[model samples]
Target chain A: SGFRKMAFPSGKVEGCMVQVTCGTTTLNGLWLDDTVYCPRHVICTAEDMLNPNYEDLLIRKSNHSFLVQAGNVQLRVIGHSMQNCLLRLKVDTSNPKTPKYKFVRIQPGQTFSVLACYNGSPSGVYQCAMRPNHTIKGSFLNGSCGSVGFNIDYDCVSFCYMHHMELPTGVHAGTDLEGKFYGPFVDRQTAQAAGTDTTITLNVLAWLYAAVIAGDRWFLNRFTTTLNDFNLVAMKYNYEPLTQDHVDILGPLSAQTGIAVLDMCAALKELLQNGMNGRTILGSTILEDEFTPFDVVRQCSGVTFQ
Target chain B: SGFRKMAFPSGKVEGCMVQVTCGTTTLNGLWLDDTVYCPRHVICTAEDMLNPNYEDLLIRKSNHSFLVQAGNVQLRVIGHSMQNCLLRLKVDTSNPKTPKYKFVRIQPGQTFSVLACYNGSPSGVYQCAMRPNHTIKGSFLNGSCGSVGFNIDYDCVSFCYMHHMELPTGVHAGTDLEGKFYGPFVDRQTAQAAGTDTTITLNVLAWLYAAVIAGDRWFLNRFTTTLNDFNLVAMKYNYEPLTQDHVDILGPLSAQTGIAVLDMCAALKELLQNGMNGRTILGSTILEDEFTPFDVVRQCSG
Candidate 1:
C-alpha cells in the first residue's frame, strides 16, 4: 500500500532526494505541445518514473519538489518537510509497457537525499514542476532546502511556448502598448512639417494622443453597449493617469471624455458662426494640446486669437 | 439826410425780378452747373431800391414800395407787401461777388414746402439733413441718411496739375470698417474642400472670427493701456467708443471685465496643453494682446 501524505496545496516541501545523470545521446523528451521529440537525453527519477495515479500526481505544488535526472543535471530543494509523501509521476520512453518502477522510503529524519539515474544532455536547466490534485503551483529550482541541482534548465521552454500561443495579433494602429503606430498629430502644421529630424518625436506625440482618444472611445463603446447605455451624461468623468493603473482605468474614462469633447466643440462652432458677424469669441487658449494648461492661459488674452 | 431812408445791404434777394439786356450782342442765354444764367424781365419795389433802416421804416411807412429801373443787369422786388418780406432768389450767373441767396421763412398760419431738384443720374441716393439750429449738419445729394460713402477722392486722390490745379485721377478701396475677416470653413480640410460657390460664406466666417478676436484684443488693449498710463481705468475710458460718455459709471466695470477676460484666456490655454504631445501652444492670445481675461479648465475627463 502506498503511504499517504499530507501537504498544503501550494506549500513547499523539501528533504526529498532525486537522481542526476549526464550523457550525449539523442534521448527522447516529451514536449508541452502535442508533438513529442527527443532532445540530447532522456532522464527520470524514482518518483518521476512510477506513479499510482497520473491525475493525483498532477497537483498544483511549488517548484521545489520532484527532480529531473538529466546527464550531469542536479537540483536543490529548500522547503519545509512533510510525512509519508507519496510520489506519482509518468515516464515517456516511446514504449509505456516496459515501465520502470521504484519505491524508496524517506528516512524518519525530517530531511533526506537520494540519487537516481536518467538520461539527457547536461546542457539545459531542469525545472521540477508540481501539479498536486491537478492544480499547478511553482517554486524556483533551488527554492527548497536539502535539494540541489548540478545542471538545470532556466530557459522556461514550456512557459515560453505557452505564452507564444496565447498572444494575439493584428490590432488596430494605435492599440500598441508602446505606441509605435498611428497617432493624433498635435497640429496640422506639426504633422505636415515633421521631417526626419522630428519624425520620432512627432510620431511619439501623435501616438500618445491617439492612444488616449482611442482608449476613451473604446471604453465608452463597451460601457454603452453593456450596461446603461442610455445615460449619456452619466458616464462623463475626468480621467487622470498618475500611475499605470490609472492608465488602465482610462479605457473607460476615455470613452466618456471623447463624447464630452465632441459636444463642446459642436457648441463652440455653433456659437461662433451666427452670433457676431462671423466672429465667434473664445475666451480660452486656442492651441491647448501642446502647451501646459497654465502656460496656455498665461499667454492668451481677450479673444486669444482674432 | 437822404430822405432818412433805412439802409439795406447790397445783395440780390430772391423774388426780386431781374433783367438781362443781351449786352448789345444779344448774348445767348445759357445754364452752368445746373443753374440758369440769364432772365429778361426786371422789377423792383421802391422800398427796396431806397434802403430803409428799422427806425425810419417804422415812422415813414412808405406807400411807393414798388419800383424798377435798370441800366445794367438789376434784380428788384415786385410788390408793396415786399417791403418787409424776404424773397426767393437765384442768380442768372453765379459769381462769388454777385451773391445769390434764396429766402425761406416760417409764418404762423402758412406752410412752406421745401423742394430739391434731382439731376436724374444713378450716382447714389438722396439724403435729407436737418439740424436743430437750421444749419444743415450733413447733406447728401445721392445717398440716404446715415449712409457712409466710400470716399475715393479723399483717400486716393493725389495732387496733380492740369495747369497748376489739383485733381483726383483714380478710385480707392476704402478701408473696411473692421479689419478682421471671417470664414465658414473652420478647419483646413473644410476650407480646402470648399468650392468657389462657398467662397464668400467661408471667407466671411473666417473674417468674422478674426474680427471678433481682433475686436476683443483692441478693447482689452485699450483698457490695459489706460490702466497702465493713467493708473485709473476710467481716467482714460474716453478712448473707448460707447463707453466714453459713460466713463464715470463704466470705467471700473470696463477695467474689471477686460482684465477678467484676459486672465481667463491665459488660464484656458494652460489647461489645454497638459498631456498633449508635440503641438506648439501659442500664448499670445491673452498675454500679448491685452484682451479680455479667459480661464482654462482641465478637460482630461472631458
Candidate 2:
C-alpha cells in the first residue's frame, strides 16, 4: 500500500504526462500494478490553490535529490536519489544543551520521515542531509555528518518554509524573491574572510524576518545592499539568480500533507519568537528583542559595517 | 711724667738692668729725673713670692719689653715698647649678648691698663693684645692686632692665672708643668687645620679639667692621644716644646689677686657650669651635665 495509482493535473510522472480532470472526468496515466507512472507531476484544485490559507503547506527541494514535506510539525522525506542513502535530520531548539536528531536508512526510490517536537511550544530550526548508503557502513549519520544539506525554520506559532541552504563551502548565495542579491560571498573562503558564519541559516532568516517586519530604512537599506551583492556574486560565478519559483512549491506539498500553504499573514505571529534572545558581542549585551530595528539604527547611528 | 724710675725683681723691665737685694742689701740700676733705666732687675722677696697667702701682689714680665701688675682686679701695663702702642683687651663672659672690651693708647716707657669685671658671679675669659700706635688709628684692633697677648679665665669661686699665650700664627705651643709637650701649632694655617682654636682657651681648660676629674678611660685616652698627636706635629715641623716657665707666671698673678692658684680640688666646683648645657649632635641630644663620663662609656659599651 506504500505505492498507489494517482491522477495529476498537468505534469509528467514516471515518464508519462497527465492532466487534472474535474467533475468525475478521468485523467490519463499508466495504471501499472500498484503504481502510477509519471515523469513529473503537479496536483491541485484551482480554488484551494488560490486560497490565502493555501500557504500552510511546507515543501522544499534542493539539487541533491530529495523533497521534504511538513504537516503539523511532522517531516516527510521523499528520497529521489538514484541509489539507496542514509538520511540524517537535526533539530536545534536553540537550547545549546539538547538538540534533537533523526537518522534513517532509506532504500532507493523510498521515503523516510519523522516527527520532531519539543516539550514547550515545539519551536526550532531543522536541517536534513544524506550520504550514499554505500558510504555509510553503520547507522545513519549524526550531526557530524558532512554532506549536501537543506534546512527549514518553524517559529511554531505560524511560519515555516525551506529556510535556505548553507553549504559546507559557503552560503549557497542567491537573491531574494525580488531578484536582489544578499551577499558578496558565494564561497566559504570569501564568507570566512568576511567574518560571517554563513552556515547558521537561522541568523539569515531571523535578520530577513526582522527586516521585513520592521521595514525601517536602516535595516532595509542594508538588506537591499546585501541582496544586490549576492546577485553580483551569483552572476559572476554563473550561478542562477534565485527566483520565486525556487521557493514557490507550496502546491505540490499540499497534495501530500492535506494542508494548504501557510499564509504570509501569519508570518509575524512568531517573527520574534524562538532564538530571539538578546545577543552579546565582546562582552556587551545587545538587547535584540527589546529594541526595534529603528531603535537599533538610532543607537548604532555611527556604526559602520563592512 | 709718663715714665718713672722704679725698682725691679730678677727680670728685665724697660731696657735697663737691675737686681734684687735681701735684708739690708741694696739693688742697683739706672735712675733719671723721672725715668727708670734698667735692662734687667729683681723686685720681690722670695718668701713673699713663695707664700701661697701672699696674694696681695701682681708682677709679671715678658721678653718683649714690658711688665703687668694687678691689684684687686685692676691691671697696670708698664709699656716699654720702643714706640707708642695701642692696648686692646676683651672679656668674653661667654654670653654672646654682652661682650666687654677696653682700649687705650700708651706712650713708650709708660703704663696703660684697665680693670674689667662682670656681674652674675664674676666668671669670664679675658684676652689682651697690642699694636703699634702708628698702625692703629682706631680705638680698637680687631683680631688683626699682632703683638704680645695674654688671657685669664676665673670662675670666681677661686681661680685666676695668666692662662697662656696664643700667638696670631700659633699657640705659643709648649709643655705643661709636668714637662709634657702640649703643642707647637706654629702657624695659623697649621692650628686651623689641626682643629685647634688656640684662641678659645676656656673650652680646652674645661675639657681637660673634666677629663682628669672624671678619669674615664675613654675620654682620657682620646685626650692623651690628641695631645700626643699635637706633640708629633710640633716635632715634625721642628717647633720648640713648651716649658713650665711659660705657665709659671700664675704665681705672680695669684700674689696680686688675693686668690690662691685654684687647687685642682675645686676643679669640679665649676666643672659642669657654663658650656655643660645640653648639646645635640646630628639629632641625638646629649644631657652633658646629667651624665658622668663613666655613664657615657657604659651607655656606649655595646
Candidate 3:
C-alpha cells in the first residue's frame, strides 16, 4: 500500500542524501548532472565523494592525473590539471597500510620534485592527489587517485660526473644522457702532488658507486658495516655525521643526476681526516674501510643524522 | 823479468778465451763470433747490462730493436732482425729475484706471442732479449735485457664482450676494438631458457675481472680465500683444477682477446654443477666463498 510522503529532518537534509522508505514505500534522490540529488539524504557512497561532477561538493575530481618520475635519489611529480591545488604525495615500498607522505603546493601546470630519501625508503611506488587549497564544511577528500609505480635502478651519473671531473688526464670518462663536456676539475698529476687524500676520497666514492650498481647485498652490507665502524671513529674524534655544509657541497653534484658523488666525498673526507689523526688505533679501520668503500652519496643525501 | 806464453787447456780455449797472467806469463785464444765478451777488463755497471748499444766483440746487438706489444691476456714479441734468434721474455711484477721468464724462437722478421698469464702475474714491467739461435760455450745469457716499462691498468674488453652478448634484449652494450658485431655465440633468450648456468659462469668471470681491476691486495686476498674454499668443495666433489677440457672451452674465447672468460666459466661450472648435487653441506661452502669473487679471468687467461 502507498504511504504518505514525509519530510526528512533538517539536519539530515543539510548533509549527504540517502534513501528513505515509509509504509512499504521507497523514495530515492533524483539523479542530475551525474550526481544523486537527495535533499532528504544524509549519507553518500564513496563513488559520489570522488566524482568531480557532483555539485556543492567541497572536493572534486582532478581534470588530469598525477605524473611521477623516479630518480636515484629523488622523485619528480607533475599535476597535469590546470587548477591550482594542494598536493599530497604518498610512497610505499613494502607496506600498504602505512606509507610516507609529503605535501606540496602546485600552481597551474607546475611541477614539484621531492627527495626520495623519505624515511630512508630509497625505492617504491608513489601516488598523489590534488584538491583546491581552500576547503569548506562537509567536504570529503578524494582517495581514489591513480598511482605511479617505479623501481629504483642503478644510477651512477653523479659518481661518474665527479669521477670524470676528479680523474687525472689519462683515465676514461663517461657522459650523461646529454653528451656534453667531460674531464676532472683537476689533473691527476696535481692531485697526486697535492696529496692523494682528495683523490682517494673521489676514488672511494667512485668505487662505492660501482659496488652499489653491482647490486650485491652482501657487498653493500659489508660496505655499510665498514662505514659504521668508521662513523664510530669519527664520533670519537668529535666529528659530526654530516652537516648542511656537507650537503651544500653535494647538493649540486646530484641535483640533475641522482648520483650524489659529492655527498660521498664529504663523508669520506670526514672519516679520512679524523681517522688519520687517530691512526694508532684506527689504522686497520682506515685501511679496511678504505679498501671496501661505502655508498656515501646515498647515505649523505637520503639519511638524516641526529 | 819477461815470461813465456803458454797455451791453456783445449776445452777452455774451445769455449772462451780468458787472458791468464801467471808470474809474467801471458795467454790468449781465438775470440770467435760465439764468444761472449762481457769485458772483465772494464768495470761494468748496472747501466751496462741495460744498454743495447754497448758493444764488445762477441754477441753484439742485433740490427733492429725488439718490438713488444702487450695485449689483454698475452704479450707479443717481434724481432725485426733477419737472423734466427732465441727470445727470452722476462716479466717482473714485484719480485725481481724471481721473475717469470718465457722462451720463444723467432725466424727472420717473425713475431711470437706469449700468454700474459706468466706465472700468474698479470701485470708489471717486461724486458726481453734476443740472441742468434747458436750459442757459444762461453756465451753468457744476459739476465738483464733492455726492459720495456709497463704498468697494467685495467682491461674489461672481454668481460664487456660477454656482458653485451649475455645481456637480455634491453641492456647497454659496448663494442670491442672493432664494433662490427654484438651479442655472444648464442642469443640471450635461448641462453636464459636453456638455464643460466652458462650465463652465471660468464658473470662470475666478469666479476673476477672487476676484482682484478680494482687491484686491492686485500680485496684480491679475500677473493682468493673465497676461491680456495670453492676449490676445496670442488675437490671434495671430485672436481679438478683447470684441465684440458677447461682449456678447450677457453682456448677460443681468449685466442684474440686474452681474457679467459671461458676457462674461468668451465672451472666455475665444474664446481657449481658438482657442488649443486652435494649442496646440503656444500651450500655453506658455496655461499661462504661466493661472498668474494676471484680474479678467475686473470688466473684463467691473462
Candidate 4:
C-alpha cells in the first residue's frame, strides 16, 4: 500500500542524484523521513556566505528574543542558544513597557549563557531570563517550536558578549566612580591651567571645554534619570535584580549620582552668561570654576568615567 | 563759613557714614551725598521697610543703583552688607530680559557663594558670582553720578580666583586624576572581583560592555576628528593619547556599568523565556542566580 499510494516523480527514494518527471518529465521532492528538508538547502550567495549580516544570519524569523516585529504575529519566545555559539541582540529602540512578541527554545549540542531583554521604550521596561536543559515539548507555548516571526516594539534585542560574565562588583564600581568622581577636578585643573595668561591661545579652549562638560553633563544627567525611572518601574513589576553585577554596578551611585548629576548641571548655570538674569545664591560664592578639571578629563577619556 | 555751616541739622562726611538732625525743619541740598543718606539715627521697623516687595527691591528706582526725583532723597549701600539700609522708588515691570533695574555686588565676605540678580517672573531663575574683596561701587550708565531716581540695567560683573593660578601642573593633575583611574584587570580573577560572574552572566554583561568599548574605539577613531574640529574652530587645539587614567577609568567596562544601569531595569532579550511577546523573564536560571549576588550589593549600597 505504501509503495502503491505514495509515488515520487523519481523511481527511488534515497539518492544524492535523482530526477523528477512531470507530464512525461521528472522532478524530485527529497526527504529525510518526517523531519527537515533534505533536498531544499538555504539559498546562498558570495555575500551571504562570506559577509553575512551577523544579525540576520544569527536569527532568521523576527519572533526570536533577539529579532522582533510589531503588530503582526501572535506568538511568544523561549530562549535559545548553541552550546559553543555566542548569541546577542542590542535593542536601541522600543517602548518602555509591554514587550510585543514571543519565541521557542532550541537546544544546541551544548549549553550557552542566555540574556534578558531590554525594554527601550519609555514605559514599563524590564529584563529577560534563560533556563538550561529546558524540554522543548514542555516549555513550548502556543504550539510553536524553535524561533519564529513575532513583534516586540516595547523591548530591545540582546547581543553576544566576547567573554561570559566574570567581572567583580568593586572593579565595575571603581571604573565608573573613578570617571565621574574624577571629572570635576579635571575641569577645575584645566581652568586653573588657563591661568591669568588670557593671552595664551589655550584660554579659548577653556570655553569649549566648558561646553563639552555641559554636553556630557546633559547626557549623563539624562542617563541617570532614565535609570532611576527604570529602577522604580522594574521594582514595581516585582522583577529582582538580574545579577550581583547589576546591583554592584548601579548600587552605590544610583540616587546619589542622580542628585549629583542634577546639582552639577545646576551649578553650571552660574557660568552661563546669557542675560536671562535668573540667579540664586547657593552660598556666598559661585561655583563657575569648580568643574574645570572635571570637564577636562571627560573630553580626554571619551568615557563618562564615573 | 565753617562755623555758619555747623548747625544742628548739618554733618561732615567722615569715611562712608552720615550724621543728621533728629527733627529738621529743612535740610540743605548741599548737605546730602549719594554715598550716605536718610537721618542716620532714625529707627525704622520691619513694617516701614515692607513698602518694597521682596521681588521689587532690586527694580525700585529710589534704590542706590539709580537716582531720586525732585525732593526725593538717595540712600547709599554701605560696605559688606545691606542691613538697616532703606530706599523708596517706583516699581518697574517692563520687559523681562532687560528689566528696568540695576544691582550692586556685595563683596565676598565669609561665605562661599552669593546670589546676583535673579530672573523674577514665573521663571524664577538666578545667576551667581564670587567676589572676595568685601567692597564694591555702583553707578548708572547714563545718569547724574550722585542722583538717585536714575535707572539702568546692570551688566558685566566679574570675579577673579588668584590662588588657582599658582598651583603646579602635576599637582593639579594629581588632584584631577585622583578619582578617574579605575583598573588593571589583566586576568579573570581581578575582573570577577570587579563584578563579572559565571561565563554566562559574564557574556551577558560583556555584550553590553562591548558598546562601551565601541564608544571608546569610536572616540579614538575620531580623536583626529575632535582635534580637527577643535583646531578648525581655533588653530591652537592639540591632540594626544588619552592618559592611562583616562583610558582605565573610561574603558569598555565602565560603559557596561552604564548600560547595566539600564539592564537592571530589564532582562536581556536572549535571557527570557517564550523569548518574545513577554514582559519579563521571571524564572530562575543558573546564570541568573549567579548574577543576582552583585546586583543585590548595587541596590543595597544605593
TM-score of each: 0.13, 0.13, 0.19, 0.15
Off by over 4 Å in 3: A1-184, A187-232, A235-241, A244-306, B1-199, B213-302
State candidate 1's TM-score: 0.13
The residue-by-residue lDDT of candidate 2 on A177-200, one tens digit each, is 121223332211222222222121
- Per-residue lDDT tens digits for candidate 4, residues A184-252, read 112111121111111111111222233333332321222223335433433443323223333333222
- DockQ for each of the predicted structures, in order? 0.00, 0.00, 0.01, 0.01
Give the range where candidate 1 chain A is weakest over 10 consecutive residues by summed lDDT.
Answer: A158-167
Q: What is the docking quality class of candidate 1?
A: incorrect
Candidate 2, residues B30-138, lDDT tens digits: the string is 2112222221112234454233221122124232223321111222223322111111111111122111222222211111111111110111111211121111111
Q: By the TM-score metric, which is better: model 2 or model 3?
A: 3
Error of 2 at B59 (Å): 34
- DockQ for the candidate 1 complex? 0.00
Residue lDDT tens for model 1, A169-211: 1011110111111122110111122111111111111223332
In lDDT terms, how accurate is model 2? 0.21
Give the best candidate by lDDT.
Answer: 3
Per-residue accuracy of model 1 over B1-302 as CA lDDT, tens digit each: 00000001111111111222211211111121123222111122235324434333323433223222122344332222212111112333343322233212311111111111111101111111111111221212211111111111111211110000001211111111121111121101111221111111111112122223323333222222332332232123222221222233322333434443323322222322232243322213322211111100000000
Give per-residue CA lDDT, model 3, range A240-304, as digits (tens).
34333434544444453355544454445454554434332111213222211222332222211
